[PDB]
Design an enzyme around this catalytic site. Structure first.
Site, PDB file in Angstrom:
ATOM      1  N   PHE F  64       0.832  -1.194   0.000  1.00 38.12           N
ATOM      2  CA  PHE F  64       0.000   0.000   0.000  1.00 38.12           C
ATOM      3  C   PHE F  64       0.869   1.248   0.000  1.00 38.12           C
ATOM      4  O   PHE F  64       1.827   1.353   0.770  1.00 38.12           O
ATOM      5  CB  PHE F  64      -0.924   0.017   1.214  1.00 38.12           C
ATOM      6  CG  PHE F  64      -1.834   1.207   1.248  1.00 38.12           C
ATOM      7  CD1 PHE F  64      -2.942   1.273   0.422  1.00 38.12           C
ATOM      8  CD2 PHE F  64      -1.556   2.280   2.074  1.00 38.12           C
ATOM      9  CE1 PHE F  64      -3.773   2.376   0.442  1.00 38.12           C
ATOM     10  CE2 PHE F  64      -2.377   3.386   2.094  1.00 38.12           C
ATOM     11  CZ  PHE F  64      -3.490   3.433   1.280  1.00 38.12           C
ATOM     12  N   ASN F  65       0.520   2.204  -0.857  1.00 34.66           N
ATOM     13  CA  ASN F  65       1.245   3.465  -0.970  1.00 34.66           C
ATOM     14  C   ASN F  65       2.726   3.185  -1.229  1.00 34.66           C
ATOM     15  O   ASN F  65       3.605   3.525  -0.436  1.00 34.66           O
ATOM     16  CB  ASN F  65       1.038   4.309   0.292  1.00 34.66           C
ATOM     17  CG  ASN F  65       1.728   5.661   0.230  1.00 34.66           C
ATOM     18  OD1 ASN F  65       2.644   5.881  -0.560  1.00 34.66           O
ATOM     19  ND2 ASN F  65       1.289   6.579   1.085  1.00 34.66           N
ATOM     20  N   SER F  98      -1.361  -4.590   4.959  1.00 30.70           N
ATOM     21  CA  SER F  98      -0.821  -4.686   6.310  1.00 30.70           C
ATOM     22  C   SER F  98      -1.342  -5.911   7.047  1.00 30.70           C
ATOM     23  O   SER F  98      -0.637  -6.467   7.894  1.00 30.70           O
ATOM     24  CB  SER F  98      -1.156  -3.423   7.095  1.00 30.70           C
ATOM     25  OG  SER F  98      -2.556  -3.274   7.239  1.00 30.70           O
ATOM     26  N   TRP F  99      -2.569  -6.344   6.749  1.00 29.31           N
ATOM     27  CA  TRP F  99      -3.139  -7.490   7.445  1.00 29.31           C
ATOM     28  C   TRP F  99      -2.325  -8.759   7.238  1.00 29.31           C
ATOM     29  O   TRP F  99      -2.389  -9.663   8.074  1.00 29.31           O
ATOM     30  CB  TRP F  99      -4.576  -7.717   6.977  1.00 29.31           C
ATOM     31  CG  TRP F  99      -5.215  -8.947   7.545  1.00 29.31           C
ATOM     32  CD1 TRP F  99      -5.278 -10.175   6.964  1.00 29.31           C
ATOM     33  CD2 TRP F  99      -5.884  -9.064   8.803  1.00 29.31           C
ATOM     34  NE1 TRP F  99      -5.942 -11.053   7.782  1.00 29.31           N
ATOM     35  CE2 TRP F  99      -6.323 -10.394   8.920  1.00 29.31           C
ATOM     36  CE3 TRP F  99      -6.152  -8.175   9.844  1.00 29.31           C
ATOM     37  CZ2 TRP F  99      -7.017 -10.854  10.030  1.00 29.31           C
ATOM     38  CZ3 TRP F  99      -6.838  -8.634  10.945  1.00 29.31           C
ATOM     39  CH2 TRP F  99      -7.263  -9.961  11.031  1.00 29.31           C
ATOM     40  N   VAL F 122       2.871   0.784   5.976  1.00 30.56           N
ATOM     41  CA  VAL F 122       2.184   2.044   6.233  1.00 30.56           C
ATOM     42  C   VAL F 122       0.753   1.727   6.641  1.00 30.56           C
ATOM     43  O   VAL F 122       0.053   0.990   5.938  1.00 30.56           O
ATOM     44  CB  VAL F 122       2.205   2.964   5.000  1.00 30.56           C
ATOM     45  CG1 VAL F 122       1.157   4.055   5.135  1.00 30.56           C
ATOM     46  CG2 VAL F 122       3.584   3.558   4.807  1.00 30.56           C
ATOM     47  N   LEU F 123       0.320   2.292   7.762  1.00 31.91           N
ATOM     48  CA  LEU F 123      -1.018   2.046   8.279  1.00 31.91           C
ATOM     49  C   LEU F 123      -1.995   3.093   7.763  1.00 31.91           C
ATOM     50  O   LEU F 123      -1.605   4.189   7.351  1.00 31.91           O
ATOM     51  CB  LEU F 123      -1.014   2.049   9.807  1.00 31.91           C
ATOM     52  CG  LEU F 123      -0.099   1.033  10.495  1.00 31.91           C
ATOM     53  CD1 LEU F 123      -0.352   1.024  11.992  1.00 31.91           C
ATOM     54  CD2 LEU F 123      -0.287  -0.360   9.922  1.00 31.91           C
ATOM     55  N   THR F 128      -6.825   9.234  14.614  1.00 30.03           N
ATOM     56  CA  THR F 128      -8.166   9.364  15.158  1.00 30.03           C
ATOM     57  C   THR F 128      -8.178   8.779  16.562  1.00 30.03           C
ATOM     58  O   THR F 128      -7.559   7.728  16.785  1.00 30.03           O
ATOM     59  CB  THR F 128      -9.210   8.654  14.286  1.00 30.03           C
ATOM     60  OG1 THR F 128     -10.526   8.952  14.771  1.00 30.03           O
ATOM     61  CG2 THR F 128      -8.993   7.144  14.289  1.00 30.03           C
ATOM     62  N   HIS F 130      -9.547   6.603  18.255  1.00 29.60           N
ATOM     63  CA  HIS F 130     -10.353   5.393  18.248  1.00 29.60           C
ATOM     64  C   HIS F 130      -9.437   4.185  18.152  1.00 29.60           C
ATOM     65  O   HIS F 130      -8.298   4.274  17.687  1.00 29.60           O
ATOM     66  CB  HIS F 130     -11.357   5.383  17.088  1.00 29.60           C
ATOM     67  CG  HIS F 130     -12.316   6.532  17.112  1.00 29.60           C
ATOM     68  ND1 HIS F 130     -11.984   7.789  16.657  1.00 29.60           N
ATOM     69  CD2 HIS F 130     -13.598   6.613  17.542  1.00 29.60           C
ATOM     70  CE1 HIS F 130     -13.020   8.594  16.803  1.00 29.60           C
ATOM     71  NE2 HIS F 130     -14.012   7.906  17.338  1.00 29.60           N
TER      72      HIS F 130
END
Lengths: 149, 158, 160, 149, 149, 160, 160, 160
Positions: F64-65, F98-99, F122-123, F128, F130
């Site tokens: 990702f990214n 990421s998973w 990268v997450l 946030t 949460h």
């Protein structure tokens, strides 16, 4: 639409419905009874017996048979297809399918050698004879989709 | 004798007739079995493994040269496809007229899975309707339907 | 419905079918040749059975004109299964074109597991009275590999 | 995209990956193994052998080969280009590159004279023969990007 | 193409191929090894576990998952679909599929209630936790296609 | 010209750099711990050297990214090489998201060759107040694997 | 592929599902009511079980807007089968429109075999503050038949 | 990538290549002519070798249509280097147009260091059955300079 496989399937559907109506009790009266079969295949089980010899043509015939049954409301789940080496042993295989209580009609598909015989052919005469006798004895419709090369 | 063995017999009507018997014997054994669960169109076809099957052969003696090559063709087809030579019963009859009656006796045994009929027919040099040839085809066809057991047709014209 | 249309076809005569039978026959023939000899006293004849149980096969197929090639591969698999083979014992290798068949086949034939190899593909043109270099090399390569490794390799190509 | 140089590069990439997978240990079982090569060139080293004769056309072919390798994730740092006078000596130069342990695949590019031969040509037959024999002996993919004028 | 069911299927395919390559023996050397998975589903068996709660949305998610597998060369014959009452019991059903030796990957699909929690949710935290622990213990890829309403 | 524009950049401080150093230090530390003890007579201190010669590493990176992740991976490789390591002894594994990091890392850590693993990714969101389930699981998985296999695993993710 | 797309859908909540359950519950309730009484000594409570083994059902469905009606019928069949019923014991009758439902249902309810009837259909318009004559007659007919024949009839129509 | 696209081209046949060879041959020929004579007793033949080690060259190139001219200049340099010359011993002069070639070439030819001069350029039009004044003057000037200074000057122009 124009192959004998399509035509054979339609005849099997119509005959299966016609038999279903005949066993019903007769009408009250006051007119002439008329019996006929409709062209809806919903809820009917079919069996197909096809030969492998001259496979170039039969695949188109089996193609039409399956297409016709589905197009007229038949469920593909209810078709049983059996393949045999040659035309000589179509009748014996058809008899095994016709004796199952879960089959409403049987369709036989095959190809026969050239018809320019001197007077008679000894293999072709047995396929038609066997299927006809089988239908009457078991009281169940069997359709003849065989063609001559 | 070795000259006789050296000849090839793959592909003669004895070969094809035996091969059809093997397929039909396996096909019926599948049909009698439990039906499929469902969820799709269900297709049947016979495998070509001949191990464990019993066969019977009926052959006439007329034209002793042609017949022998046909009978040996059938036997090698069974053996080369896995069959054992101890599970073949061979019956010989004077002529083509009495093939159906002999084939009936073999077919009624419970130890036979299929029957193969081999013979040759005399061709008159003008094309009339033969009253002997028609009776062989008619008789064999009736027996298979009545007994519900495959019978294969392996005759030729001279 | 198209799944049954394609599944309702038969694959009994295409060149994939005959190529498989030759591999089955040759693989069984070699086991008898390099086994114990006969008792003599008569001419000894060797010939391969058509029982395909316990044999391992490998198939190399080109990707050009996959419409036809796919049907040849299915024919080869059907022949092995219908003669008693197990689909567990088949290895399939795909290559870009016909030029790459001999090198890939060489890799598979060197494994100790496999007993025979089947080569399937479609050649270009072919219908011209001229010598084609790609066609000649593919035939040459397969022939040389078989003789060098002493392992049968079957040749199931066609022209179109 | 449409020149033989582009096609030759793709074949070299796919064959290099396929060989990498074959040397891996076989699977557990329970299904039919299928081997194939992917079209990612990352981490692969290539060599190119090109002839100078009829240079007007080959430059476009070598152009496509280098473009294809880079476009599919290949690093331009890993290409070794060797030039030879004519097509007769492509095989001998290709053999020197193929024996290096740092090369995964080799691409041969060249042009041959008109193909309207009476029956046979004695120079063209040797280029193809030599490359084919070389690939089998060394067990390494060699691609044929040669064309006929 | 744009639903989480489509994305979940792609991840399962890629991870299944990646595992297949890792078990293969390492390379000779002379460069940095790079491992990656390709996007061809041919010859792979998949399992899907889906919940019935809020069925209006999941059917579209299961729709995408089956469509993606077939579109990328997968055979529909190799998909096993299991349905469960709610999301609480996705992990227990997924574990039964993952222990079959004929399954290469498992896809979990479900919907969770609104995420405007005060600080924490006690049912959502267990679904993700259970699937993650299950994947590591069995050493088999399990994909998370769950979404929040 | 863009090749020099990207090659002229430096990669000395990004999280890939620090993640590599921790792996180098921990890998050397373990060799001393499970070696022979000291002579006593004084407090014994253990600490890992920063010499990376003869050590094998593995890197797991999400996709990702990839614009940012690619730069973190290059930073990790530079750190190993500049401290005496050989690029021959690095294994790189790419995963969709990421998973999938913990399961892939588990495969690499079980090999006898590798001495440490570096996880890069990268997450999503992250900024946030949460509790995020994907972030928590990835951290949990890597921590459990390290303790179970007794092999260091470094955690080089970032938020964006 | 469309066969699995339609087969992958679920039919657990549509009005066909609830109509079937009511028929199952009422059919079992009547068997207990017209059976032997209790022993007394306490208030007696009657309620129907949800076991659908050995019960015969009949379904009357209109043909207007068959896209939606087909899904309601499938829901009704699924409910009966999943509670232990046999598909052998279901009779299905199709009628041209909503006006013909009560007359067809009357024919099926007079048979001694059937234990309950389920009516399914889609009404026209409906979303208007006016009295509709077709809607009123269909509701009236089913209500009268149930009371006259003393046999439960379930009402599973919808508006659109 | 464009750097390799241009660098991957070959420059073996363009007019720059042949112009360089003539200069190499003539420069070596003159050294033998003005050296010691032969022993006689037979017809004496003079011819120049193609070894370009220790020779100094000068190149004058016009700037019109620099796309083509640049490739001719590169061809000339390649010929000298590939025959054993050193790039240290090449002087390059650029001029605005074709009219200025003879005057610039005259400056270079008067230096004692240089052994031959190569003129490169592209003429305008040319493909017309008419007498062009610029073309005639450039050819005339180079011819006169060579005869006056007794130093070879090669003529490598083209038309377009």
């Amino acid at each position: 639409h124009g192959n004998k496989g399509w035509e054979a399937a339609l005849s099997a559907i119509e005959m299966a419905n016609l038999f279903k109506s005949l066993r019903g009790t007769g009408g009250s009266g006051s007119s002439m009874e008329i019996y006929e079969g409709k062209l809806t295949a919903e809820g009917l089980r079919f069996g197909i017996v096809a030969s492998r010899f001259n496979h170039a043509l039969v695949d188109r015939l089996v193609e039409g048979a399956i297409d016709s049954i589905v197009r007229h409301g038949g469920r593909e789940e209810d078709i049983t297809l059996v393949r045999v080496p040659g035309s000589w042993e179509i009748p014996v295989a058809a008899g095994e399918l016709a004796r199952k209580e879960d089959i409403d009609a049987v369709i036989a598909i095959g190809v026969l050698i050239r018809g320019c015989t001197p007077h008679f052919d000894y293999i072709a005469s047995e396929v038609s004879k066997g299927l006809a006798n089988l239908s009457l004895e078991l009281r169940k419709p069997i359709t003849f989709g065989v063609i001559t090369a």
